[PDB]
Design a binder for this molecule. Structure first.
Ligand SMILES: CC(=O)N[C@H]1[C@H]([C@H](O)[C@H](O)CO)O[C@@](O)(C(=O)O)C[C@@H]1O
Ligand SMILES: CC(=O)N[C@H]1[C@H]([C@H](O)[C@H](O)CO)O[C@@](O)(C(=O)O)C[C@@H]1O
Ligand SMILES: CC(=O)N[C@H]1[C@H]([C@H](O)[C@H](O)CO)O[C@@](O)(C(=O)O)C[C@@H]1O
Ligand SMILES: [K+]
Ligand SMILES: [K+]
Ligand SMILES: [K+]
Lengths: 258, 256, 257, 258, 258
């Protein structure tokens, strides 16, 4: 792909705007945005998480206006987590911080992640415990060995399906993703406070050091996200992951390629 | 069609004010506080009383009567009364035997916006089965999808003491004519960190050099400043809020 | 006043250097820099703190060389003096755990300073409007429930030492055009003090038009609060601990009409 | 070396891309990336850690295209920790946060370190306790004295072997390392949260204040890392170090020297 | 003195490189870098710390090449705490974090300080408790009064001797020190985590707003430091300060003065 000039004229720019909903596991008809309560295996080899207990990566493939060689080039992103204030509900059968106190808020381990590319996000598998038995309906690292706990280059995938790729098994592959820009933060620890900023005044530029943004193959834009905000603690002490949706607004321009 | 800025004597004005918090005000002595928080016995029976729910604050400020429109260019803002949180002697729960009272701390939301029309809101519910109380304006026809995103839940922040903080956020798909800024810091032991200074200015211009344009010569200011919770001797906890200062500089802009 | 040109020449600059001591309550002859130990009221309505339990704003009015020309404050260097004293964890403190060192000063802090050409202007805000503030302090009068969020009756000048309780008053953002102020409240009973010292950091006091505070009557006003946190005694009782603040201000002569 | 001009043209640049795996101790065939459970000596004089309980520095010597005077000059680095999301496995034989709660995540003391150089990283030994008996198979400060607890200039070494130099005994020698760029952060304390950021948009420039990067002696590039993320607590309360792999991508150019 | 031009030519620059060891109290022949265990007086009045329980400021006076009017002007500083990874020894007579856990790492109150000057650092005394009895062998504020607890201007000194000036009763005097640059941070609290960064890529410029660095009177450079990293808790629960050495590299140039 030899990248040539940007087209100008009213015809030459478009914008994509949407929200990606979280895929936390949704253990029943009332619990969209939550996982199943977390249970702990008695040994590493008996770790066998249920599908509804595992947060997964969210992905949307967004069709763009048909171009054909011109390709749509992603230039800027505005993004934010939607519903941050819902975490102020400390009255809905939570565990009291102390006698007569309010409910404990969502807190603990979080992962906030987003990416914009001209093709599916490329993944590398890394396992906390290579003996974990991942459940039917998920897509997970296969032929796992003990080396999979640090780096096994067999574990390559594309984030090409929703509700499928568990967050804990997969990360962006830094050896690939030439045509994607990704950003993520893991903040670990059972008592970590969510710190969630919102504003409509912040923009991320998606251009690389050569002035080129992701180029959308087949006129498809790929957006991916994870927003595990922490865990909700019920009155009983049981804990569930809670996630939130992520807003994306991407500005694209037409670029000629050879 | 946004054209040139007017210059000269007549061409600039300034709005200054304070927005008071709306934390619930459970009796005649408790302005700035919510009712003590109670916890539902089950998830599906969540039913908070009105005076236990902090709400968004809003003020519509009339501007000098003027096509010209007032354009909001700069903002200075801060929380007013930060030091009041040093009152650790007013029947609080002692940190330990013979200790001082626990200060206000825990989950906070600090938010402000400036716009030329009402802030546009999107509803998101922690629990879609929460029964919100009479006197509040809340997401209607809630479904389980309301827990992550239900696009039916659209509203305007057009009334005080009405829109609960926990149900609503700025709608990022709208608000083209508003600039908003907010931070949620969650967790029961989070410390308030509150900065004051008269030397900091936020510029409200967009990337094209245009600020919010004030329709009908009105400026919209919105805020939430839930600072955390106060813990009483008994262990019961109430939200505590503070007022927010706004100073906005505006200039006359021609529009076609 | 029209602000005209800065005067130049050897004669045209001056410098003020001083320290402001903290006013934490000083409950006896050995406890300068500390408050009285904190007591908690039995009911919310009966809150009635003693004067020696209430830290106050510090202020100094500094006379400048006699001079229309006015002295214009241009820069500030400032820092908290005696930060290392907080390493004394061996003086009648409460042990962190069995056999452990004493708990250091920690918890709620307020660090504040201002430089102006007239007294700092204050606005009152009350945690609890039914608090009975003690004789010898200057506090918001005619308090109502609105005073818990905003009652514009409560206006004052920081014009006296050992008088204006920190917990009652903040800088009035609707005034103070001729002062620059800066403060941080860090609340919570376990927050760690984080105190930086250096002689290499300068704050510029000029506004967006390039004009600094202009000293009316050739007086410079400096104000400070440095409540570093609470010291916990062996018994568990807790006292506020404050420290002094250094100020160095550079000033220049400015013509006005 | 007198440093002269940079060569230009198609042939004048090369890139190195790889991952360094962590060397945390690997106490059995299922625990790659973990140390042995930590045990505590009764006294300073009886401190005698086993080899599998001691994380070590990772190092790779990467041969570069043969040049001969020209040398490869390292100019930029992209790096990130691989597998950050694996730390969201809070269901695999971990100690519950509280009754009925999720497993505690990896947390506590961490050391994140990386270096890029034109020769081996130079190390200086500093011991917490000079009377520690370091185990067979490790390379550790020899002839330790009480002065070794603060600075004993005898303890000089090169990071020239994997699985050998314990992290707790050695630091980069600030008095040397003119031909290396190193960066590290120790965050100590039993409850500190991991905060791990990932993105493919961040580059570190390796040039010094004269515009000169590490110069690769004998056409070898040396990459070194430690990423001790914290400790994993199992259900019994025992704690093990957990580490992760680090990705490196280094761009190099040819430089003439005299 | 009037500061005139900088000298140029290869003769005109010099460099000082050294390390300053910590002086934490060194309670016996095996505990270099540690204080004595910390004990607590029953009253303010009875506060009487042992010499070996009191960390002190470190100082080195470094002779420079003889000049004579020319003076050496200090222009840049690179500095680093040496041995940060030693704090990963959590297996040496430490108190377990919980049953079967690892040892508690060094944590709690820290003071990290350094200065570079052309004369001795000027100190001002401030006492936590003016009735504290400072021990024989230390140099402390004399004629203390209750005003010494906030500011007593009688308490002036020069940092002109090692193992002498206790950290807790002296600070840099901001009313003096025109010919020194100093930097320090106190982080207080019993559980605060050490956060220690190391790199050889960071330089501090020592020039003031007029482009003039410290001028070395009598061809002597003064380096001062404190690096109290926190406290080590042994198995009994007793606590000792732990310090580390600090590296300095200072670049100087010849300046003419009148
Ligand atoms: C948000 C919610 O629904 N919480 C409820 C949970 C979850 O439904 C399940 O744990 C999901 O797996 O179930 C409980 O029996 C429990 O574990 O204490 C009651 C609790 O009120
Ligand atoms: C600030 C305040 O008023 N605190 C009081 C509260 C609140 O009035 C209610 O909780 C409001 O809902 O009532 C108490 O009975 C309580 O809960 O312990 C006594 C306490 O002193
Ligand atoms: C630093 C100090 O002086 N501590 C003493 C305090 C204070 O003098 C008062 O609390 C001031 O109000 O008084 C005690 O009775 C206490 O409260 O435990 C004894 C303690 O030794
Ligand atoms: K690649
Ligand atoms: K839009
Ligand atoms: K060197």
């Amino acid at each position: 792909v030899e990248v040539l000039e940007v087209k100008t004229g009213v015809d030459s720019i478009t914008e994509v705007e949407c929200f990606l909903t979280p895929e936390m596991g949704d253990p029943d008809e009332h619990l969209r945005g939550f996982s199943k309560s977390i249970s702990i295996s008695d040994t590493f080899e008996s770790d066998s998480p249920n599908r509804d207990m595992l947060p997964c990566y969210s992905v949307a493939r967004i069709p763009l206006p048909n171009l054909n060689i011109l390709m749509w080039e992603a230039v800027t992103l505005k993004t934010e987590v939607i519903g941050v204030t819902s975490l102020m509900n400390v009255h809905s059968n939570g565990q009291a911080t102390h006698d007569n106190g309010a409910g404990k808020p969502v807190q603990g381990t979080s992962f906030h992640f987003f990416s914009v590319g001209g093709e599916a996000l490329e993944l590398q598998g890394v396992l906390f415990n290579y003996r974990t038995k991942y459940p039917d309906g998920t897509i997970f690292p296969k032929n796992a060995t003990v080396q999979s706990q640090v780096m096994n280059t067999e574990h390559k995938a594309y984030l090409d399906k929703n509700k499928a790729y568990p967050v804990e098994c997969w990360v962006p592959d830094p050896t690939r993703n030439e045509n994607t820009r990704y950003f993520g933060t893991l903040t670990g620890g059972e008592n970590v406070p969510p710190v969630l900023h919102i504003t409509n005044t912040a923009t991320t530029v998606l251009l690389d050091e050569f002035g080129v943004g992701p180029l959308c193959k087949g006129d498809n834009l790929y957006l991916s996200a994870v927003d595990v905000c922490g865990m909700f603690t019920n009155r009983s002490g049981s804990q569930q992951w809670r996630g939130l949706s992520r807003y994306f607004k991407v500005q694209l321009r037409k670029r000629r390629v050879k």
